Paper text:
Among the best studied TCSs are the nitrate/nitrite-sensing systems NarX-NarL and [name]-NarP, responsible for the regulation of anaerobic respiration. NarX phosphorylates NarL in the presence of nitrate and dephosphorylates NarL in its absence; [name] phosphorylates both NarL and NarP in the presence of nitrate or nitrite and dephosphorylates both proteins in the absence of ligands. Whereas the sequence identity between [name] and NarX is ~28%, their ligand binding sites—membrane-proximal parts of the sensor domain’s helices H1 called P boxes—are very well conserved: 14 out of 15 amino acids (residues 42–56 in [name]) are identical, and the differing ones, Ile45 in [name] and Lys49 in NarX, are responsible for the differentiation between nitrate and nitrite.
Previous studies of NarX showed that replacing the arginine residue (Arg54, corresponding to Arg50 in [name]) that coordinates the bound nitrate with lysine or serine resulted in loss of ligand sensitivity and locking of the receptor in the phosphatase state. We obtained the crystals of the [name] mutant of the sensor-TM-HAMP fragment of [name] using the in meso approach, similarly to our previous work on the wild type protein and its R50K mutant. The crystals belonged to the same space group as the ligand-bound symmetric WT protein, F222. We solved the phase problem using molecular replacement with the structure of the ligand-bound WT sensor-TM-HAMP fragment as a search model. Surprisingly, the backbone of the [name] mutant has the same structure as the ligand-bound WT fragment, despite the Arg→Ser mutation and absence of nitrate in the ligand-binding site. A hydrogen bond between Ser50 and Asp133 is observed in the crystal structure of the [name] mutant but not in the MD simulations. MD simulations of the sensor-TM-HAMP fragment of the [name] mutant of [name] reveal a fast transition to the ligand-free-like conformations, with all of its characteristic features such as diagonal scissoring and formation of a continuous α-helix between H1 and TM1. We conclude that the crystal structure of the [name] is partially artefactual, and the protein is trapped in the ligand-bound-like conformation by crystallization conditions or crystal contacts.
Author numbering:
A (entry chain A), B (entry chain A): 1 to 227
The structure:
Amino acid sequence: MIVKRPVSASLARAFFYIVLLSILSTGIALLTLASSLRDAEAINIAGSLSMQSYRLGYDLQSGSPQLNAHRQLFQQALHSPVLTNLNVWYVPEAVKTRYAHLNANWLEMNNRLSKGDLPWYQANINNYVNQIDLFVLALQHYAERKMLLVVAISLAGGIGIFTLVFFTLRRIRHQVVAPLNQLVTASQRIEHGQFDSPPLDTNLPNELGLLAKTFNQMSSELHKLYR
Amino acid sequence: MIVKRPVSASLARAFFYIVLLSILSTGIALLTLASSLRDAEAINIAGSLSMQSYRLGYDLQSGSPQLNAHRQLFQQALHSPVLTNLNVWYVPEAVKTRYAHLNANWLEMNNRLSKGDLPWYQANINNYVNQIDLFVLALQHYAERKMLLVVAISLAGGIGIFTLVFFTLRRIRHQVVAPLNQLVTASQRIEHGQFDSPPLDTNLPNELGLLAKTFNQMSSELHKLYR
């Protein structure tokens, strides 16, 4: 007789998938989360462009001496590390295309401000800032989709591990634990002149199926000897 | 003889902790994530207050007919659902205390704007908006701490499940799989007149420790009979 389906191989497999599913879930989540750590910063800084843009016009109307320093504070913000890092493959094209528009708009805005053209500012500042808000809204939606992705993965991971464990434990109980108990009981009985108990089920394709067959034959011979 | 440590109870326990750790991790993460879904929105809207505040001053300087509609657009934003939901127990006191300051500042700002007091606006708008930025920065840091919490949990969860599985599989192999193989080999040997092989180790406190003892006695008697 032979064991066609060893428990060692079955168990190895069962646990492998439990881990795999854990590593996968955890991995995607951590990779997503890692890409998101500075989302709130990006949205903050991006949003500040809106305010800086209207401040500039307020500076211009009031002849503020801070105009030039504010024009340089915008440029630094616009080209901040957090925003320049947006030009990366996993960031949606829309977010990158809008950022490029903002950079082009600034060149005209900053030029007009150097000439002190107030009438042009008053005629364009609404549209100018609208494009900035649509960029902030883009970052917001992007940050939301990524967080939702983590929720889906976290949920499927947990549900997936709960499901695997259920069936894995259900298989071990049916194919190992229960039969083992039947072997122990039969063994304890045979050891005490109890020989007329239901023979052991031998239909399992694993080690316990073989043990049952050997026991059914080590037992049946005794009963006959005595008996 | 008896089984002092059944495999059924040992396994139940092992898998229980694997699930528990999965449910716990997943649960805290999903609860944190659920509280964070609108973080990016809050930061966006909060940041827009900064811009709306300077626009109002720009309106005032240019005698814009939109002044009153913008004064009403700020109030709606300031009291938006996303910001009013901040007054909840799990939100840090700082974020709630700053929001309360913004609401008080608005009452004075909106009043001065109704009187058309430009000189007061010019003298206060810097400080006014600074408090708004510190509120946005507070929301940003809050959103960052919560995301980091999810990273810690996700990491510990994955590492925790990988660790549990390792030792759980290592215990089953040492206490079930290996001995089972020894029982099968001995059984296959005894079945073919091989009687001088090393007796089975009987030191396990589980079912297999008992089976070994019964086998060592069902075997030893045969060898003597024949042999």
